[PDB]
Design a protein around this motif. Structure first.
Motif, PDB file in Angstrom:
ATOM      1  N   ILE A  10       1.075  -1.141  -0.080  1.00 16.77           N
ATOM      2  CA  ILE A  10       0.111   0.102  -0.215  1.00 16.77           C
ATOM      3  C   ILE A  10       0.778   1.164   0.015  1.00 16.77           C
ATOM      4  N   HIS A  11       0.764   2.174  -0.871  1.00 21.08           N
ATOM      5  CA  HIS A  11       1.517   3.333  -1.071  1.00 21.08           C
ATOM      6  C   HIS A  11       1.008   4.608  -0.235  1.00 21.08           C
ATOM      7  N   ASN A  12       1.763   5.108   0.517  1.00 20.71           N
ATOM      8  CA  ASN A  12       1.719   6.253   1.336  1.00 20.71           C
ATOM      9  C   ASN A  12       0.326   6.081   2.269  1.00 20.71           C
ATOM     10  N   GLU A  13       0.073   5.028   2.958  1.00 18.08           N
ATOM     11  CA  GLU A  13      -0.754   4.772   3.677  1.00 18.08           C
ATOM     12  C   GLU A  13      -0.159   3.811   4.970  1.00 18.08           C
ATOM     13  N   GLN A  14      -0.794   4.122   6.263  1.00 18.66           N
ATOM     14  CA  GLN A  14      -0.382   3.557   7.230  1.00 18.66           C
ATOM     15  C   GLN A  14      -1.401   2.428   7.812  1.00 18.66           C
ATOM     16  N   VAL A  15      -1.072   0.974   7.993  1.00 18.08           N
ATOM     17  CA  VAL A  15      -1.946   0.095   8.492  1.00 18.08           C
ATOM     18  C   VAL A  15      -2.188   0.401  10.113  1.00 18.08           C
ATOM     19  N   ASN A  16      -3.310   0.812  10.481  1.00 16.00           N
ATOM     20  CA  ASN A  16      -3.775   1.456  11.645  1.00 16.00           C
ATOM     21  C   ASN A  16      -4.537   0.247  12.480  1.00 16.00           C
ATOM     22  N   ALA A  17      -5.327  -0.732  11.681  1.00 15.32           N
ATOM     23  CA  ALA A  17      -6.176  -1.489  12.407  1.00 15.32           C
ATOM     24  C   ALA A  17      -6.349  -2.684  11.768  1.00 15.32           C
ATOM     25  N   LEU A  18      -6.578  -3.930  12.538  1.00 10.45           N
ATOM     26  CA  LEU A  18      -6.570  -5.217  11.972  1.00 10.45           C
ATOM     27  C   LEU A  18      -7.653  -5.916  12.402  1.00 10.45           C
ATOM     28  N   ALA A  19      -8.271  -6.836  11.823  1.00 13.78           N
ATOM     29  CA  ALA A  19      -9.348  -7.675  12.291  1.00 13.78           C
ATOM     30  C   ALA A  19      -9.258  -9.282  11.692  1.00 13.78           C
ATOM     31  N   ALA A  20      -9.217  -9.960  12.600  1.00 12.64           N
ATOM     32  CA  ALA A  20      -9.230 -11.545  12.198  1.00 12.64           C
ATOM     33  C   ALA A  20     -10.631 -12.185  12.381  1.00 12.64           C
ATOM     34  N   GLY A  31      -5.771   5.574   4.373  1.00 14.60           N
ATOM     35  CA  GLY A  31      -6.401   6.118   3.284  1.00 14.60           C
ATOM     36  C   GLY A  31      -7.687   5.300   2.812  1.00 14.60           C
ATOM     37  N   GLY A  32      -8.092   4.176   3.250  1.00 13.75           N
ATOM     38  CA  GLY A  32      -9.041   3.685   3.062  1.00 13.75           C
ATOM     39  C   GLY A  32      -8.880   2.369   2.064  1.00 13.75           C
ATOM     40  N   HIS A  33      -7.421   1.951   1.770  1.00 14.91           N
ATOM     41  CA  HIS A  33      -7.235   0.572   1.131  1.00 14.91           C
ATOM     42  C   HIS A  33      -7.394  -0.450   2.129  1.00 14.91           C
ATOM     43  N   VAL A  34      -8.429  -1.229   1.839  1.00 19.16           N
ATOM     44  CA  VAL A  34      -8.501  -2.448   2.866  1.00 19.16           C
ATOM     45  C   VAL A  34      -8.164  -3.805   2.137  1.00 19.16           C
ATOM     46  N   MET A  35      -7.461  -4.558   2.827  1.00 18.42           N
ATOM     47  CA  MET A  35      -7.010  -5.967   2.276  1.00 18.42           C
ATOM     48  C   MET A  35      -7.194  -6.832   3.315  1.00 18.42           C
ATOM     49  N   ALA A  36      -7.889  -7.897   2.688  1.00 19.77           N
ATOM     50  CA  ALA A  36      -8.450  -9.156   3.478  1.00 19.77           C
ATOM     51  C   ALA A  36      -7.859 -10.126   3.130  1.00 19.77           C
ATOM     52  N   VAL A  59      -9.962 -10.279  -0.782  1.00 20.82           N
ATOM     53  CA  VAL A  59     -10.565  -9.246  -1.355  1.00 20.82           C
ATOM     54  C   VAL A  59      -9.840  -8.059  -0.998  1.00 20.82           C
ATOM     55  N   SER A  60      -9.169  -7.164  -1.874  1.00 17.23           N
ATOM     56  CA  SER A  60      -8.539  -5.963  -1.534  1.00 17.23           C
ATOM     57  C   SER A  60      -9.255  -4.678  -2.086  1.00 17.23           C
ATOM     58  N   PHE A  61      -9.744  -3.586  -1.478  1.00 17.03           N
ATOM     59  CA  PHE A  61     -10.506  -2.663  -2.069  1.00 17.03           C
ATOM     60  C   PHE A  61     -10.260  -1.412  -1.431  1.00 17.03           C
ATOM     61  N   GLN A  62     -11.054  -0.264  -1.942  1.00 14.77           N
ATOM     62  CA  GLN A  62     -11.023   0.960  -1.447  1.00 14.77           C
ATOM     63  C   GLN A  62     -12.487   1.273  -0.712  1.00 14.77           C
ATOM     64  N   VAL A  63     -12.462   1.645   0.540  1.00 10.96           N
ATOM     65  CA  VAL A  63     -13.820   2.208   1.127  1.00 10.96           C
ATOM     66  C   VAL A  63     -13.801   3.545   0.361  1.00 10.96           C
ATOM     67  N   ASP A  64     -15.109   3.703   0.248  1.00  9.84           N
ATOM     68  CA  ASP A  64     -15.804   5.192  -0.003  1.00  9.84           C
ATOM     69  C   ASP A  64     -15.813   6.187   1.009  1.00  9.84           C
ATOM     70  N   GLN A  65     -14.565   6.605   1.488  1.00 13.14           N
ATOM     71  CA  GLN A  65     -14.256   7.461   2.457  1.00 13.14           C
ATOM     72  C   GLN A  65     -13.805   8.735   2.172  1.00 13.14           C
ATOM     73  N   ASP A  66     -14.492  10.012   2.693  1.00 11.65           N
ATOM     74  CA  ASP A  66     -14.118  11.051   2.359  1.00 11.65           C
ATOM     75  C   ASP A  66     -12.952  11.524   3.116  1.00 11.65           C
ATOM     76  N   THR A  67     -12.256  12.860   2.929  1.00 10.38           N
ATOM     77  CA  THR A  67     -11.114  13.294   3.579  1.00 10.38           C
ATOM     78  C   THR A  67     -11.383  13.689   5.120  1.00 10.38           C
ATOM     79  N   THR A  68     -12.760  13.770   5.517  1.00 11.60           N
ATOM     80  CA  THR A  68     -12.991  14.461   6.904  1.00 11.60           C
ATOM     81  C   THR A  68     -12.433  13.533   8.034  1.00 11.60           C
ATOM     82  N   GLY A  69     -12.180  12.159   7.821  1.00 17.36           N
ATOM     83  CA  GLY A  69     -11.679  11.520   9.112  1.00 17.36           C
ATOM     84  C   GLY A  69     -10.959  10.222   8.603  1.00 17.36           C
ATOM     85  N   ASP A  70     -10.034   9.872   9.420  1.00 21.13           N
ATOM     86  CA  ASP A  70      -9.140   8.741   8.901  1.00 21.13           C
ATOM     87  C   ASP A  70      -9.569   7.529   9.685  1.00 21.13           C
TER      88      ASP A  70
END
Lengths: 381, 705, 126
Positions: A10-20, A31-36, A59-70
């Motif tokens: 993932i380019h220029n994003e930090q992986v902040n949270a994980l879920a198993a 920035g909203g890139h989610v890889m499972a 499944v790796s995709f992007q959440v439809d997230q705006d710039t308002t929050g991370d």
């Protein structure tokens, strides 16, 4: 033990949270890139049954997230995937196909913005109890707690907190009977809450904890009896290193055993293993029952796993990353430990039974939960 | 466009009409409010001029423009809100600087008062309301608390050093996007530098500016210039502490805070450089500012690495000062943390040279992109300070063409008031040290003085390496040429640099030539012991000269003067030095230790030039003297004593020893005074025939005086 | 009597297995870290611990040919002077800094066993 280090693509994003979730470990970038990913694929890769170059997300995709929050908050179950930013929240029902045990497409995911908050009101923590079916919202400025029903997002109750008591993190009861919140003013609050959301503050413990403006991951004991209190204030000599206090649920939260951390900054992520482990001493005919808890500091890439029946940590993985650890997770059996960091690099810890001991069945752990002290029932008004 | 122009003309006409009959104050100044509201959107200098009039009419904010007059329509002063001040100040920034860099722009103090008013109305950023602001401040304090690793320097040079801050995205995000605290801090620092030139600046003024820089930085503005300014503030603090406070240098605890400030300035500079290196499309002006920042960081590294610091800013203590140490018994021991050095010194030298090499590289790049750029001698001066007691001039072909350029820039940019002596001074010092130690080929070394004859203005035979003599005679004639250049340094205005030339004069005359008398004659004009109404050391401080030189340097010159006097064993001038030093307490620090050393040299010179046997007068002579015999011989001596019957050295030494015994704690001058008395006054009368003896000495001194 | 500090059993050292160059500047690294007794393959007793660092093992696995320290210092600084007139995994000659002395300092500081343990009970100093 097998450790596999994997820098994510993932380019220029930090992986902040994980879920198993089940056989799937789900990763969330900044920035909203989610890889499972399937956990079993990484298990075989760690034991070199799967080559490194063949490993790809499910499944790796992007959440439809705006710039308002991370995004720092992802929870839910195999039916609904609740993903929360620092100001907004989306729940993804039907995200996993029930029949094939495979991830549905994002079009098949019933995406819905469940709640959005505005600045300066900031979300501090997101929790959900499977046993109660209630989603817990922790909010700063103002300090309020919101309870929400699973799959319907119905506001079941609201708990309002003091202004000086800004909530930092919450702790889920494994039996679904209580909830414990750590606040900014070194105060710790326990709430007796039922399935209907009626809550009751049962214990208030102040000047016990030391909190900083970060995101923390703390688990309770799988028998729902031992409360870990990292960065303890009360009982610790001043100007020493940090410590983690273990408090018994049935013994009025007296300090049982103490973990002597090094002189650096305190732990950020704490995860009990879900399995209860047993080492039978064949020489004495005795069996030593113990849990394994993974802990990691908030500054360096140093992670330690702790045996409850030992006077030492099992081992010390020092300076694994140059950055801080964002999230760690056990597998469902507890024979695999996952861990994520800021530098978009994955660290998977593959264990054997000789690495961990004999894991007890979940019926045993439930029976151990049954010995714990029963609360009086909540009076419904 | 035309709407704003017509609005400006109409507003000016109405303002003129109201000032013509002094009546804009009707309807509560809401006309002024509306006009201010509309002129906030009109970005032109005429709208700005009418806005100056609006601010003077409404809140009575007098904006000093040379072509400006008050349109007084009799309006009372109001108070401006923060809500109005923010776009007003943003308009002021955007109209004042436009596309010009405010750092490179001349500081107009016309807007400065109203800038302070807007800052006051804004106040500080209120904490405890944003997790972002609290977390970013906590990260900033962590990053300042971080120790110094070479890998951190590698990541700075590669631009991999980041703090990964988040912009709060608040209402005031756009104000720090304007860099409001940056401009306000720039004005504050410019006025601070102007007061520093007048030497009226004070360190307590900088803390508010530092806090403003913190508040601007925690907004994640990605402005490395704020880091440059904060490191510069810490640099000026460190300069004040090192130059104007020797007691902070001697005390290691204040030296800890000095090393902390050095570390903070270094961290600000490293963050600035790595932020610039993280920028992709770096323009030329970014190179111009970051080149200066490289110079500042290299200067700070030179300051922190060397004496008297000697790498204290790289030695790290943990914040938890006590280490819980596990004993082998299973018991826990509290153990105090030690300072641990976090980088090898060779890496520090590499970092210094890499900073200066990249500075020279970027200087070449900028001069390729802007050929009217004027270079600096400071790179060669800092490389010579690297060469200070490290290399010995082994690279003599490379010693040439860098000190050449340094001296060339120093003389060619020398102003008429005072030329840039210091490259030529350090060239003279290095030539002396390496000729004396023989480390260099003298031919090219003296040939470079033909180039530096621009600064020297002497004959070419001085720079011809005339090796047709004994080497000592060549060195001595070289010292004559250096003394000639020292007279040339006396010829210049010499604003604050007379004293170290006299020091080098003494070093030439004593250490090398062996003319102790000439060195004494030189230093007697500098140190007037034999006078009475003057001071000890005449560095021209009647009531005007600033401190800083005579704090340590006068002490060192008095040390060398004690060495000079001990070479010829003169005790009279030493006693006059001590007498002048008793009244010279404010002229230097550590007056007690220097007084003790001067007492030691005076007593040693008196014992050596005149000769004594001390362990006899107290323990042996005093118990063996009969009391009536001592009284009789002392009374006959006091009746007999004439100053003409004894040498003036003996009587003056007795008088000076008794006066210093009355001045100091007794014991240091019992031996000399009792020796002079019993050797020259008591026993010669006894052969013909403590309090009591010192009372008889007092009677004989009252006979002398 | 309290149970004594039995010595840590000799655990076999962790060894880097496979390093594969990813598209990122940092490659993916597989390391087997043994967490058992190396003689009996049993679960470790209560007095065992495994302590290791990442980048020290990186430089040791990739670059065993470390030359003389003073010679390497002189070579690097003369290289910098001659240049006047990220290779992650490989040894960057363009990087001037040598960390091995500071690596030894960190090895000595981590070689302290003092502050890293478990205490059963409140921290009461004797």
């Amino acid at each position: 033990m097998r450790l596999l280090k994997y820098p994510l693509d993932i380019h220029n994003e930090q992986v902040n949270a994980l879920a198993a979730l089940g056989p799937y470990i789900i990763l969330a970038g900044s920035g909203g890139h989610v890889m499972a990913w399937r956990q079993q694929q990484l298990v075989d890769t760690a034991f070199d049954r799967v080559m490194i170059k063949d490993l790809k997300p499910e499944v790796s995709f992007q959440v439809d997230q705006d710039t308002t929050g991370d995004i720092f908050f992802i929870t839910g179950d195999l039916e609904t995937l609740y993903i929360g930013s620092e100001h907004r929240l989306w729940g993804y029902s039907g995200w996993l196909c029930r029949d094939t045990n495979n991830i549905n497409s994002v079009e098949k995911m019933n995406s819905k913005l469940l709640f959005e908050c505005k600045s300066p009101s900031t979300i501090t923590d997101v929790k959900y109890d499977i046993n109660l079916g209630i989603l817990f919202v922790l909010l700063s400025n103002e300090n309020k707690i919101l309870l929400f029903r699973h799959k319907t997002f119905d506001k079941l109750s609201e708990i309002t907190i003091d202004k000086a008591s800004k909530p930092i993190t919450g702790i889920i009861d494994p039996t679904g009977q209580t909830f414990t919140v750590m606040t900014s003013d070194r105060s710790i609050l326990v709430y007796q809450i039922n399935k209907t959301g009626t809550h009751k503050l049962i214990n208030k413990l102040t000047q016990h904890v030391q909190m900083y403006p970060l995101h923390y991951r703390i688990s309770m004991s799988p028998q729902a009896d031992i409360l870990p209190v990292i960065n303890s204030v009360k009982g610790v000599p001043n100007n020493a290193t940090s410590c983690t206090a273990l408090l018994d649920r049935n013994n009025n939260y007296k300090v049982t055993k103490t973990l002597v951390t090094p002189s650096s900054n305190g732990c950020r992520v704490l995860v009990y293993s879900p399995a209860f482990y047993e080492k039978p001493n064949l020489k004495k005919g005795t069996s030593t029952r113990y849990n394994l808890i993974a802990t990691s500091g908030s500054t360096d890439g140093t992670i330690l796993v702790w045996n409850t029946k030992r006077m030492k940590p099992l081992f010390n993985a020092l300076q694994v990353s140059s950055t801080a650890i964002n999230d760690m997770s056990w597998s469902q059996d507890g024979f695999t430990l996952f861990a994520i960091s800021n530098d978009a690099t994955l660290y998977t810890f593959a264990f054997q039974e000789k690495d961990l001991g004999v894991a007890l069945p979940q019926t045993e752990i439930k029976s151990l939960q049954e010995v714990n002290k029963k609360l009086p029932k909540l009076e419904e008004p | 466009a035309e709407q704003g122009i017509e609005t400006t003309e109409l507003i000016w006409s109405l303002h003129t009409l109201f000032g013509h009959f002094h009546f804009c104050d009707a309807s509560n100044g809401k006309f002024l409010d509306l006009a201010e509201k509309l002129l906030c959107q009109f970005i032109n200098n005429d709208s700005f001029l009418q806005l100056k009039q609006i601010l003077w009419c409404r809140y009575h904010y007098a904006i000093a423009s040379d072509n400006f007059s008050p349109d007084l329509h009799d309006t009372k002063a109001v108070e401006m809100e923060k809500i109005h001040s923010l776009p007003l100040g943003t308009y002021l920034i955007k109209l004042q600087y436009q596309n010009k860099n405010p750092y490179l722009s001349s500081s107009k103090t016309t807007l400065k008062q109203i800038m302070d008013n807007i800052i006051e109305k804004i106040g500080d950023p209120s904490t405890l309301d944003n997790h972002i602001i609290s977390r970013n401040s906590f990260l900033l304090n962590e990053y300042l608390s971080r120790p110094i690793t070479a890998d951190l320097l590698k990541h700075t040079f590669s631009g991999a050093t980041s703090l990964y801050l988040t912009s709060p995205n608040d209402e005031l995000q756009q104000g720090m996007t304007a860099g409001l605290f940056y401009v306000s801090s720039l004005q504050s620092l410019g006025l601070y530098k102007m007061r520093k030139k007048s030497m009226q600046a004070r360190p307590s003024e900088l803390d508010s500016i530092i806090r403003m820089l913190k508040n601007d930085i925690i907004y994640n503005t990605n402005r490395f210039e704020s880091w440059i300014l904060l490191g510069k503030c810490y640099s000026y603090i460190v300069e004040d502490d090192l130059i104007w406070t020797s007691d902070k240098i001697t005390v290691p605890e204040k030296k800890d805070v000095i090393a902390l400030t050095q570390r903070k300035a270094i961290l600000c500079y490293l963050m600035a450089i790595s932020i610039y290196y993280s920028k992709l499309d770096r323009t030329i002006d970014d190179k111009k500012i970051i080149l200066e920042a490289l110079d500042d960081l290299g200067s700070m590294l030179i300051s922190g690495y060397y004496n008297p610091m000697n790498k204290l800013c790289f030695s790290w203590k943990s914040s938890a000062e006590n280490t819980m140490r596990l004993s082998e018994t299973g018991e826990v021991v509290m153990e105090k943390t030690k300072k641990i050095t976090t980088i090898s010194d060779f890496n520090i030298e590499q970092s210094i040279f890499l900073c200066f090499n990249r500075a020279c590289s970027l200087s070449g790049d900028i001069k390729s992109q802007d050929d009217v750029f004027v270079l600096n001698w400071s790179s060669f001066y800092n490389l010579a300070k690297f060469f200070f007691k490290t290399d010995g001039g082994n690279n003599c072909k490379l010693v040439a063409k860098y000190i050449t350029q340094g001296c060339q820039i120093a003389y060619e940019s020398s102003p008429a008031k005072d030329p840039i002596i210091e490259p030529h001074y350090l060239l003279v010092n290095a030539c002396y040290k390496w000729v004396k130690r023989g480390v260099i080929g003298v031919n090219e070394a003296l040939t470079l003085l033909s180039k530096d004859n621009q600064f020297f203005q002497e004959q070419e035979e001085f720079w011809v390496n005339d090796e047709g003599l004994a080497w000592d005679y060549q060195e001595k004639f070289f010292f004559d040429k250096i003394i000639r250049l020292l007279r040339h340094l006396l010829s210049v205005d010499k604003k604050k640099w007379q004293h170290r030339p006299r020091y080098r004069i003494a070093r030439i005359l004593f250490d090398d030539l062996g003319d102790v008398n000439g060195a004494l004659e030189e230093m007697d004009s500098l140190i007037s012991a034999k006078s009475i109404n003057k001071n000890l050391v005449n560095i021209w401080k009647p009531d005007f000269e600033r401190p800083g030189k005579h704090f340590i340097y006068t002490y060192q010159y008095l040390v060398l003067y004690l060495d000079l006097l001990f070479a010829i064993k003169d005790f009279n001038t030493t006693g006059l030095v001590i007498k002048k030093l008793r009244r010279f307490g404010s002229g230097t620090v550590n007056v007690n230790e220097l007084l003790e050393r001067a007492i030691n040299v005076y007593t040693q010179s008196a014992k050596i030039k005149l000769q004594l046997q001390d362990k006899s007068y107290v323990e042996q002579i005093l118990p063996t003297l009969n009391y009536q015999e001592f009284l009789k011989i002392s009374e006959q001596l006091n009746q007999v004593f004439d100053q003409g019957k004894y040498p003036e050295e003996i009587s003056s030494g007795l008088k000076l020893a008794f006066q210093l015994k009355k001045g100091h704690s007794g014991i240091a001058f019992d031996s000399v005074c009792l020796g002079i008395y019993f050797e020259y006054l008591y026993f010669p009368l006894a052969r013909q025939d403590k309090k009591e003896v010192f009372d008889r000495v007092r009677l004989l001194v009252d006979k002398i005086t | 009597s309290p149970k004594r500090l039995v010595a840590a059993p000799t655990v076999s050292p962790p060894k880097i297995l496979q390093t594969a160059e990813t598209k990122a500047k940092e490659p993916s690294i597989l390391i087997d870290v043994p967490l058992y007794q190396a003689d009996t393959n049993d679960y470790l007793d209560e007095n065992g611990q495994v302590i290791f660092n990442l980048s020290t093992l990186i430089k040791e696995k990739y670059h065993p040919k470390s030359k003389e320290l003073a010679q390497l210092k002189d070579s690097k600084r003369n290289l910098l002077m001659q240049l006047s007139d990220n290779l992650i995994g490989k040894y960057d000659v363009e990087d001037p800094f040598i960390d091995d002395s500071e690596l030894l300092w960190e090895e000595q500081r981590a070689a302290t066993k003092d502050g890293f343990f478990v205490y059963f009970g409140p921290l009461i100093e004797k």
